[PDB]
Amino acid sequence: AFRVLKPWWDVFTDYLSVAMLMIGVFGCTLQVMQDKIICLPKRVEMKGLKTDLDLQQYSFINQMCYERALHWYAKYFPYLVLIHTLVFMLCSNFWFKFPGSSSKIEHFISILGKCFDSPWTTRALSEDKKEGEQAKALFEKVKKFRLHVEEGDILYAMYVRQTVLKVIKFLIIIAYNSALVSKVQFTVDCNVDIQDMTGYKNFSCNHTMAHLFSKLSFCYLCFVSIYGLTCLYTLYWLFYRSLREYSFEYVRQETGIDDIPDVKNDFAFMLHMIDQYDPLYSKRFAVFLSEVSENKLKQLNL
Amino acid sequence: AFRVLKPWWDVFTDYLSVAMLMIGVFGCTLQVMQDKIICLPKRVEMKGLKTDLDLQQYSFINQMCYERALHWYAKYFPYLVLIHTLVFMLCSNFWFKFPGSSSKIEHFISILGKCFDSPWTTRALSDKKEGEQAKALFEKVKKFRLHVEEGDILYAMYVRQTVLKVIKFLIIIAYNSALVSKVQFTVDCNVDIQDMTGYKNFSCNHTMAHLFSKLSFCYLCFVSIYGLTCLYTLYWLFYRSLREYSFEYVRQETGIDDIPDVKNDFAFMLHMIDQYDPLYSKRFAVFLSEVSENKLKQLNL
Amino acid sequence: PAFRVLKPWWDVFTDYLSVAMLMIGVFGCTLQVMQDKIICLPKRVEMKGLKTDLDLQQYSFINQMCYERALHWYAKYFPYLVLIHTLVFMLCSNFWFKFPGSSSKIEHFISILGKCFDSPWTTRALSEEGEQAKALFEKVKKFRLHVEEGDILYAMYVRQTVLKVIKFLIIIAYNSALVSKVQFTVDCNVDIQDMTGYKNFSCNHTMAHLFSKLSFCYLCFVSIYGLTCLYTLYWLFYRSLREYSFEYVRQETGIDDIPDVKNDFAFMLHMIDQYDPLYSKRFAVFLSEVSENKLKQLNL
Amino acid sequence: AFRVLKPWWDVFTDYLSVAMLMIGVFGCTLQVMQDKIICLPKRVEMKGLKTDLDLQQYSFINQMCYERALHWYAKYFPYLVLIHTLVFMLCSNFWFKFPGSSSKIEHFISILGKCFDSPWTTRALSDKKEGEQAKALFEKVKKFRLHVEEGDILYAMYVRQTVLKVIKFLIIIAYNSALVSKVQFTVDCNVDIQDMTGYKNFSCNHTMAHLFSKLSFCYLCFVSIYGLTCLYTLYWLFYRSLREYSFEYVRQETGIDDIPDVKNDFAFMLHMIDQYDPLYSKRFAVFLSEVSENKLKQLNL
Amino acid sequence: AFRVLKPWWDVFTDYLSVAMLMIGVFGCTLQVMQDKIICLPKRVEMKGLKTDLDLQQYSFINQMCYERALHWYAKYFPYLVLIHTLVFMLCSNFWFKFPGSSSKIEHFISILGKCFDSPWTTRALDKKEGEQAKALFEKVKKFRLHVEEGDILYAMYVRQTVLKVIKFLIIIAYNSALVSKVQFTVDCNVDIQDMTGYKNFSCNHTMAHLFSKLSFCYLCFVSIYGLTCLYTLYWLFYRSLREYSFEYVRQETGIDDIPDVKNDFAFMLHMIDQYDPLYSKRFAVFLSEVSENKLKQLNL
Amino acid sequence: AFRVLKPWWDVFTDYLSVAMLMIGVFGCTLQVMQDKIICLPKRVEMKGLKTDLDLQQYSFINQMCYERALHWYAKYFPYLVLIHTLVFMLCSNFWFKFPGSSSKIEHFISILGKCFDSPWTTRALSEGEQAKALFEKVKKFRLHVEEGDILYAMYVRQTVLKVIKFLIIIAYNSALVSKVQFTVDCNVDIQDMTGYKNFSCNHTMAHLFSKLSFCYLCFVSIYGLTCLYTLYWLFYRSLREYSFEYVRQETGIDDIPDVKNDFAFMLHMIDQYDPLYSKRFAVFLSEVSENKLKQLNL
């Protein structure tokens, strides 16, 4: 699968998002099962007060003040969480499933798998007709892959745009979610004009799930902040190391085959992406990139 | 399997349809557990007001004003969404199963898959079993090129389905935008029940009126994106005569300057595949020249 | 299962329609007994309310007395009728698999075609083993004496579609006739005064504006169903299903002596070539004395 | 595969029984969900009557009049439906699963199945292993004829079973038709609870009275059809000698003119097997002539 | 393959046991669903009586008179029927899983299954088949030596049947004794005067007319079960099952050197011959020394 | 699951545990379905008595007296039943899944299953490579087990824990069975907020819990009796030393040695299921049989 093409920052978030999502789901459930606002008329030994209100006047007051007193944030806290998590997940898996930049990844993975474990690699890095035929076919495949992928830049622009979009969505969320968080309170006042229906004008209301939504909001800000720090680090990683230019220096130094060229653009990007998992697949691919090795295979074929 | 024949617009529209179904199901789920209407009579220190009504008269009033005061759009918003999503699903994946129509596509897919990995293409672009495989490839290519060139059964149907989807777009957006303002919270109910209840005018509240409005806005936006994608698909479909294909670049980049020009359904399929990866075309075009057949026969000896 | 190739497109279409009809019927029945089925109030023929002075059980007495005295019989038993009609359709669609007289012949035919479809001699004849081919030929010979003796496997297939068409016509008739009798507000005039004190009541049927909509849907479905059946009723009449003629195979193979079969074998070939038009081609070679002449020559 | 020995009636009655069972189960299911009875006292502008009764005295009245005024049929109809259906199913099944009467059936089925695929059967109608298998099957059939052609234990039980089922039909139809008129909607209840409630006469409504009646009618219909088929069986076992079979058609057609006429259990079972496909009879008949055995012996020597 | 060692009576008994179980679960479920007792105070135009009792004093009275007036049989009838059914089931199967009486059964059944597919039996009534027959003969001798002195596979059968019969007698006894105490309306005289104000109440038990019918049905079913078990108990004792004579097989096969088995093996043969009286002949063929001498002669 | 390595003791105790769990679940289900307390005030022609209490003062009274008047046994009986049956099951099952005492069990079962059907047993009591392999695996397993302990002490240690737990359960169930009453009195000091100080309460599941407690006591008693008999059976001879004596006279072989420790322990256990596996194993325990097999192989 696409496990080799995923640094830590691209799997770490792959869990954070999930966590975020479940919070949202929990909220939604608890917003439906649990009760809601409860409102009582205000009058601005001990004996109780008689309001002389029915069982439907109370429901009318409750469901009028629910939407005439509560701030829009308190009413819909978790739906925004679900929307944001869904958009984040859509961002994380954009260039994997987009045609025009998906076949290249599949071909690269297939060729890397083929060349990772080859007898010719063992023979070449140490210092039959079938093996020689397979080796020659794989060299031709590598050459055609190089000429077919070493011209475009689609697998880098998409990734840059993706990270930029995730970072900006971070900034917006931490902006507004932090702005509107003191408006989730417990006891509110409701001043609606229902005087000819119930006989009372001012009410005091208690929102049930206020404290819990406040706690969940703080947890969500924390998780988002971690997400944003990870994304910022990735964005720094992209824009510092000149990711569109590879350099086979260490392979040349500790291999002895001093003719490996420096590939650029998309292939260099993919090499930089695959050496963050296990820095040896670059060696195996570099084996199949020297005219010297091709000449030695031709000579041994005879 | 079939992912190769599904361009980006198709998957984009499928995701939009999935989201549409999700919001429809969300609305349907909420309507059962929360939605209701509460109606009170109108009479046009602080003390309460006595109406002197039972628990049966209140239910009478509620369920009468529900169906005599609410606009039909507010009552059944999400069922329309579900029906439209169902129609959109039916329109998609419809040009696969109207006739059998599976042999014509699976045969082409298998042909292309076996042609892509044929070493003969690589050798031209640079044992007995290889010769037998090449002979079978040529024979089945000939059979399929003879079968396909019969008419238009997998091209016009695509046009019909896209046109139907666009028409459904226009209608849905039109009447969802027209009536989106009939979802209100507080309404006035004027029913003539005075000889059994005593009150004539009532004021009612619909529980879910600030949420159906937002779900409607989200649904309308998703609809608009869907329609824009469909319009682009139609523009691309009708801008280029996809029933005729020319191997202009293949002959120049390969040197075999005798490859013919195929048309109708086969050309349509070739253009369909050209979007995913413009490499299968050359691999198939390798097995389309009689000179290649002559070379294969000569080398098999 | 095994009896899958013996289903033209309209058969699976009608199966899907029938299952959808059953879903609608069960949905309606479930929604029926899920809520309060009626709300009835007495009638008395600044603003202040009216005190009926009725207990909590007198209201239930009134509700369920007027429910079965003011509602039209259609508004109550709609889902039950939907279920009954769907079950009848499903039973009718399969009254040619379970009858032993037709089941035996169908199993024999399917076994013969299964044996013939994977016989190398068919490929040999079409391109232009041994004892098994001869034995299969005698099996085919016996087969086209066992079945070709009358009209049993075909008479019931044309007898059932007529019944289905009649049922669809009757359903349309009495379901469009009585769709406007499902009202929302009704008047109930029962004589319960020594128990309650009120004689005239006004009632609301809660799910009256729902059964209406479902009804429409139901009609539409049967309408489509009807059309399909009509096509099949037309498909069995323009061409004589009891006469078959091997013509294209003769020209595409050259074995120009295959005869024209009649009766149930002809009908079965007609009904099975619409699934995959090659079973007739594969079977055709097992019908000519030339094929057996070549078999005997090859054996010697 | 105990389906070859099942004429059309023995498979029609099974579906009838399933339908009867589902009707009974549906009725028994709604027997509990819906509230049973509603009783109010009788006093033998417009204002209501103040009964001045609690919610406990109402329950007392309802649950006393329920069992002091309703007829036993109106209360126990579904249970009787289920009991009768279970008895019918048990009677239909008391033919395969009785020791001393099940081994013969399986032996016959296995022998007939093996004989249906012997190539000597088709050979006689125009290899060492095949020859010895044919000889062994000849001996097995000869032994079997000496096994189940002495006692009619497998034929008397079928007649007993069908007679009992007909009797049950008669009883069920009789009493259901007699009592179906006692399921009423509105009833009167005259119980002596005056020192506890203050009222002596009550009027009650039985909610599930217009429904059971309908189901009851349906039940009869199904049962009626059931009985008819059983009656047909008690004309098919008695219009000829069911214990004397005649292999006349096989001799007059195939040519083998020495096949014997079996009798008793074997004749009855052949008459039954000849109600599915008249080809098993001749496949078994061909393995009953000494001429065929002599021909096989000559071919073996 | 235990069905062969399962006479007809031990199928009918299993069916009766499952019927008893379904009746019991039926009763328990409908006991859960209902509302149980309803109690009202007694005062030992028409106007209703005001008892001036709260909504919790009714619950107090109802549940006090429940376990102060109802008989112990009317409350725990379903539990008793379930317990009896479980004991019956665990009693009928206590000779398959008890160690020391299970290995013998599996050995015997496996051997009898092996000694059915043998052409030597057909010959009575080639090197590999001869060796297989000799091995089977050696096995016959060895286990016939094995299960010949430990005669515990038939005492357990008699003991379980006796236990079942005794349990039948007890159940019938106290079910007939206490079936007239399931009454509908009862009088409850509890001393609660300073908490409710009333001293005497009259109560109705909801499930007083369904339990009577279920009790009668249970009595009928258990009576049939007991009659079957009584017949089986008579069967085991009118003749010694510990001795078997192979008279008919000897007279029919002319191998008249067959000895008479005894004790446990005689019991197993007596049990098996009542399913299909043919395995005895196969074992008779495969237990004689004449047959093995003939086999040895043929082998050479 | 190792049926042969289970005697009547194990099967009977497993069935008893199943029944125990059944009644425990039944009681817990009824408690969670229909079980509560109903309390009324006390005043220490017939007419009704007015308490003048709301619909929430009753809830308050019921909740307060459900915690100050009901004994902790009356409320938590099914939970204790479930916990104790669970621990019994775990203790009885904690003998095969120990990391280090499992392979010796299934390997022994496989060896004996192979030895049961070996033709050499038939030949002796009346394929050479297979017989040699079986002899080899047998002798290596003997060497491995004769020095490997922690397969006999664990059995005793688990069957002693069951006995002690039985004793404790009897102890605290017999004493607190008379505290499950139906009618109880509740004297809580809530007068300024309810108006009454003394209440009489009914617990709705007193009699049923009494019956279930009696059934539980009987079932434990039987379980403990069986466990005591098992302990007696283990502790009256050297279960770790088996004597191959009758084999010599009833087989003819005179060179059958007596195995030591855990292997003798399993031999003693498996002898009761069927006293014939010892025969098949003793056939292969002779050092002359291997010599005869080697001679016959040539």
Residue numbers in the entry:
A (entry chain F): 16 to 59, 95 to 177, 231 to 405
B (entry chain E), D (entry chain C): 16 to 59, 95 to 176, 231 to 405
C (entry chain D): 15 to 59, 95 to 177, 234 to 405
E (entry chain B): 16 to 59, 95 to 175, 231 to 405
F (entry chain A): 16 to 59, 95 to 176, 234 to 405
Quote the study's own text:
Volume-regulated anion channels (VRACs) are expressed widely in vertebrate cell types where they mediate the efflux of Cl- and organic solutes required for cell volume regulation. 8C-8A(IL125) consists of a 25-amino acid sequence unique to the first intracellular loop, IL1, of LRRC8A inserted into the corresponding region of LRRC8C. Like native VRAC/LRRC8 channels, 8C-8A(IL125) chimeras are activated strongly by cell swelling and low intracellular ionic strength. We demonstrate that the 8C-8A(IL125) chimeric channel is a large-pore seven-subunit heptamer, like homologous pannexin channels.
We obtained five distinct 3D classes for the 8C-8A(IL125) chimera. The most apparent difference between the structures is in the arrangement of the LRRDs. In class 1, all seven LRRDs are arranged circularly with roughly sevenfold symmetry. When the ICD and TMD are viewed from the cytoplasm, 8C-8A(IL125) subunits are organized into two distinct groups, one with four subunits and the other with three subunits. In two of the subunits in the class 1 structure, K51 points toward the pore, while D50 points in the opposite direction. In the five other subunits, D50 points toward the pore, and K51 is oriented toward the subunit interface. When K51 points toward the pore, it creates a groove between the subunits. When D50 points toward the pore, the side chain of K51 occupies this space, closing the groove.
